[PDB]
Ligand binder design. Sequence first.
Ligand SMILES: OC[C@H]1O[C@@H](O)[C@H](O)[C@@H](O)[C@@H]1O
Ligand SMILES: OC[C@H]1O[C@@H](O)[C@H](O)[C@@H](O)[C@@H]1O
Ligand SMILES: OC[C@H]1O[C@@H](O)[C@H](O)[C@@H](O)[C@@H]1O
Length: 353
Amino acid sequence: DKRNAEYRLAFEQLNFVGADSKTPILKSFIEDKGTRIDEITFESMIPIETWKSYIPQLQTSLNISIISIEQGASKRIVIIKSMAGDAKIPKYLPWDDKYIEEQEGVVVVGQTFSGNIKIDLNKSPHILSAGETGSGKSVILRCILWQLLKQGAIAYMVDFKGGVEFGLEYEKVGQVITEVDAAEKLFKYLVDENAKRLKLLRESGSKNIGEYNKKFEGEELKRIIVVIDELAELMDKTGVDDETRAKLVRIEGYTSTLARLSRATGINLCIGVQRPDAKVITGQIKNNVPVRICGRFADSKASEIVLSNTKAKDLPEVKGRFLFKLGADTVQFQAFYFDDDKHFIPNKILKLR
Ligand SMILES: OC[C@H]1O[C@@H](O)[C@H](O)[C@@H](O)[C@@H]1O
Ligand SMILES: OC[C@H]1O[C@@H](O)[C@H](O)[C@@H](O)[C@@H]1O
Ligand SMILES: OC[C@H]1O[C@@H](O)[C@H](O)[C@@H](O)[C@@H]1O
């Protein structure tokens, strides 16, 4: 076997042997095909602290990037989490307007092993982006927003922290909703706008708003993008009073209806979540929000709430490194770093008269 012959030679060149004079024994090599992260298990008498001292050398000899080395069941077992030197993705990928797609409704979120990650909002209409504060979870949503604003979409932005996440420059290109009263008015409007669009599709025999628009020269329905900076501000009802709770229940009813029924109507939800919790990322959100973007979470439960697998615990500690899940596959990718100070140019959008 190639791998066993390759490891043996590598260990012998280092005289990397235990008290019994044996080089480490390969017990198992488990590759994750989507993330390209491997679990290599070795048996030897070499202490874990010695393996850790050898990390720089083992990376070079075996041609791998070592994420971690941990002791297994016994002091004879080491488990290495690694990525092959061939599984290359950037560690920094600045946004650039050259990535903007010609096809309306198609957005790019970053780079994977073979090509870029593209999302066609006409096929997978809603996105949930989850990550710890500073991960880049929110940066991705603003990058998607910019792309859609450049394709002529209408935007609505929700931020209950006084709108500090969507400053005055965002207000030039759309409406910023900063409190629960304005959010009830917004979501009741979007649910009615969705109902009016479904009515137009049935009546005209149109599959989507794109087919509808071609039928009427002077009647052009535009894509609507709704960016929710933090889903917990709309879903977490724990400490509010009776009236605010009923208002949030009404809003949740509107969000659920929107997510489930806005597939063909060109109304897209881009949701941010800082702390995954089953009360916030419910079964209704999961059943109707197909795109998941997940940052690193050391906790298994947090990854299962977002992805319904534990792979977010395996990611390397790289800023802007995420998991992408659409359907049954989970892949690792580097997200674009979109910086408002240099990438968000409101006058370019306003010029699209
Ligand atoms: O990389 C292969 C496997 O390694 C294991 O350590 C992880 O828990 C799995 O999520 C992963 O699929
Ligand atoms: O469809 C465009 C891209 O997005 C996803 O379907 C996959 O994760 C990528 O491998 C693909 O290149
Ligand atoms: O926030 C709700 C309001 O949003 C505006 O953008 C729409 O034009 C109004 O019709 C709607 O009532």
